[PDB]
Structure formats: C-alpha cells, structure tokens
Design a binder for these strands. Structure first.
Ligand SMILES: NCCSC[C@H]1O[C@@H](n2cnc3c(N)ncnc32)[C@H](O)[C@@H]1O
Length: 394
DNA sequence: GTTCGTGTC
DNA sequence: GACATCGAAC
C-alpha cells in the first residue's frame, strides 16, 4: 500500500472511462502503475499526466507527463476527464503519534484548501476532495481508499460533498493490502448525476467482480451501511439505544496522568484505572491493571461525575462487535462508552447487557459495518435497537 | 468534551 | 490471529 496489487489496479481500470484524447491523471503516481495499466487496456490516444512530490519516486514512461508537486496544493492549467490512483493515507500530526509530518504552515494551507477538512482528518480525504475539484463536469474518479469514510464523523463533510458534487459508486474490497492493516473500498465518482450505489465484490483468479448490493438514489451524505431485510427488520423492532441513554466517553489518559489522586503503583485504598482489557461480555475485571494507573475509587467522580454511579459500559476498541457489562462497583475508566439512562427510562440491566452481548446483536453490527473500522463507534452504538423487554421509555 | 488509526503480543 | 490502541487532535 505504497503499492496496489495488480488485481486491484485492474479492477479499478475496468471501472475507468475516458473520451478519446481525454486527460487522464494519476496523483501520487511515483512510477505510474495506474497510467500504465489504463494505457495497456484502452490505448494511447489520451493525455497522460502524473503528479508526484518526491523526485526519487517519479519515474514515468516518456509518453506520460511527470509533474513534481504537492498534488494537494497543485494548480493545473486545465481540469481532467479521468483521475485514478491510490492516495497516500494517514493523519497529519506530531510524529510521536501520527504518520504524516509537515510544517504547521503547510497543514494550515491544507485546511484552507479543503472544505471537507474536519477534525484530525486524513490525507486520503484531502486527496478525494482535491481530485473531485480537478474533474471537468462529467469527469470520472477511481480511487482505492480505506473504508472508514463510510461511517466516521471526520468524513461527514466529505460524504456530503460527494453527494452534492455528483454520483457515487462504492465497491467494498476489505483487507486486500498484504501486510497493511486496513479494510479498503473502491470509489467510482462521476461529476454529474447524483445518488449512491453500494457494491460488494467477489475475488477470483480472473480478478474482482462487482456485486450490486443496494442503491440510494437520494443519498445526501448519510452514513453508508450494508443493509439487508434482516437488519431493517431488527431496527424497527425497538427504540434506538441512544434514545434511552446519554452516551459519554471515558476521561482520556492524560486527564488521569496529571490528576493528583492518581498513582503509578498500587496501594492502600487504591484501585486500578480500567481500560477495554478490563471489560468482558457480561463482567468487569476489577483486579487487573492494564493502564499503569491507580487511584482512590471515590475520587474518580472528580474526572467524570458519572464515575460515581453504577452504569452500563460498552466497548469501543474490540472491533465491530457489541461487548457490554454492568459496572456495579462504579470504578474509574480510562476507556470505553459510558451510558447514562435518560429521564423516565426504566431499565433491566442484566437482561439488557444479555441482549447487547447476544449473538443476534453481533451479526447485526457485522452485517452493517463489517470491518470498516476496528471499533464500535458512537454512530453505530446509538442506533442499536432495544425492545421493551430491556428498556422502556415511559 | 471525544475522536482516530493501526501496535504489539 | 488476539486484542486491543492512547493521546495529539479539535
Ligand atoms: N500512489 C502510490 C501510493 S501513495 C505513495 C506515493 O505518494 C507520494 N505522495 C505522498 N504525498 C503526496 C502529495 N501530497 N503529492 C504528490 N505525491 C505524494 C509519495 O511520494 C509516494 O510515491
């Protein structure tokens, strides 16, 4: 995934279209395997262009035009009919935590250039917006990117943008990059029309085959899910979990790190600051320490008020599943979701926990969100259906 | 307040 | 595969 597998390249080329003599671009091209593959497949009567930032990487055939620039700050003379490629992925931030390292002034420039830039954001998001803006009307884009933009908040504006700028086809590939931890999708964007079509794929020796899954003709940027009749059925059967509960996150690690009550060793009256490694399906391991942090249990409420109260805990970083337990002791947590019943909500804690851990709930989330992200996110959690057995809003 | 991507066994 | 980041980001 500084290299794309040949069958991914070929799959993408099979989705790509350009008029005769039309302008074809590969951003972050290096040696330009997408331009090479498109030319092998469709011939030579096109204008082939490759943008690369690193002169050690730029190595195009003499029939293509190579440009040494930052694709994201680059201002071409003319727009393009087709843009295809594999964007660089990663968060721009401090080298101690994040992979992309640019001067603050450059990231300032990126944030000014991109209307979709939200939160920490990502290089692959910036690349997608850049490319759509360099398309002529009716132009086509074919990119391979992580799947995380289908569901995540950072990419809400990117999704709204794509829905507003034309028509979108999404093909799920999954973990198709050897030795890279990512679930991938192929986007086919065309700068005209509207709506969204979602596709699954089939992988053979002959390569990838698209399987039409679902169509959203009036898509506006809504989260993208693999919906079935079964998932729809379960979703109407109860109240959304978010209507019953206030959903809060744990206090972060540095909040605890600097609190005068928190120690780095166990001792009299001291209790471990819990993490996801303490949370199990239906129970909490209060004994083990995984954070390296101890504090008096009674002092936990100074970090979050709700730490003083027995409440429901749901997992965030165990993949796309629902792992829940009742925290009857009310301990300090460094991780996970913390759910507080809304005014007039009658709950049955053990019966609700039991339902959230159930195999029915596991399939449900795995069907909708697959392996897009290594998390149960707030957006997935709040839409979980809860029938009257487990919680009732009077 | 809380988000996001591998990191390490 | 297991089993989850954890803190700089806003
Ligand atoms: N398309 C192949 C994978 S992405 C890796 C390539 O993207 C290039 N790259 C990363 N950021 C870039 C940018 N902002 N503009 C142009 N090329 C970039 C790298 O130099 C590298 O050759």
């Amino acid at each position: 995934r500084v290299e794309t597998p040949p069958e991914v390249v070929d799959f993408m080329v099979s989705l790509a279209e350009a008029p005769r003599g039309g302008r074809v671009l590969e951003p972050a091209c290096a040696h330009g395997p997408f331009l090479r593959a498109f030319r092998e497949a469709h011939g030579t009567a096109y204008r082939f262009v490759g943008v690369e930032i690193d002169p050690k990487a730029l190595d195009l055939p003499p029939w293509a035009e190579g440009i040494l620039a930052d694709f994201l700050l680059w201002e071409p003379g003319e727009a393009f009919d087709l843009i295809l490629g594999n964007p660089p992925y990663g968060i721009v931030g401090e080298a101690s935590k994040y992979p992309i390292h640019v001067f603050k002034a450059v990231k300032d420039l990126y944030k000014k250039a991109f209307s979709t830039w939200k939160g920490k954001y990502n290089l692959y998001g910036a690349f997608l917006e850049k490319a759509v803006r360099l398309l002529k009307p009716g132009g086509v884009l074919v990119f391979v990117v992580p799947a995380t933009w289908l569901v995540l908040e950072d990419f809400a504006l990117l999704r709204e943008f794509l829905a507003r700028e034309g028509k979108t086809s999404v093909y799920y590939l999954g973990e198709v990059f050897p030795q890279k931890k990512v679930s991938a999708v192929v986007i086919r964007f065309q700068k005209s029309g509207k709506g969204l079509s979602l596709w699954d794929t089939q992988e053979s020796e002959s390569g990838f085959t698209p399987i039409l899954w679902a169509e959203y003709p009036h898509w506006e940027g809504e989260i993208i899910r693999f919906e079935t009749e079964e998932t729809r059925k379960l979703e109407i059967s109860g109240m959304p979990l978010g209507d019953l509960f206030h959903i809060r996150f744990a206090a972060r690690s540095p909040e605890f790190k600097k609190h005068p009550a928190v120690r780095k060793e166990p001792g009299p009256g001291l209790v471990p600051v819990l993490t996801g490694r303490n949370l199990k399906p239906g129970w909490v391991d209060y004994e083990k320490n995984h954070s390296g942090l101890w504090m008096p249990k009674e002092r936990a409420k100074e970090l979050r008020d709700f730490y003083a109260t027995p409440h429901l805990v749901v997992a965030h970083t165990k993949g796309t599943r629902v792992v829940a337990a009742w925290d009857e002791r009310a301990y300090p947590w460094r991780e996970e979701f913390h759910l507080l019943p809304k005014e007039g909500v009658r709950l049955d804690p053990s019966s609700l926990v039991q339902w959230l851990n159930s195999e029915a709930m596991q399939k449900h989330v795995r069907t909708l969100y697959r392996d897009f992200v290594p998390h149960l996110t707030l957006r997935m959690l709040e839409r979980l259906p809860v029938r009257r057995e487990y919680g009732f809003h009077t």
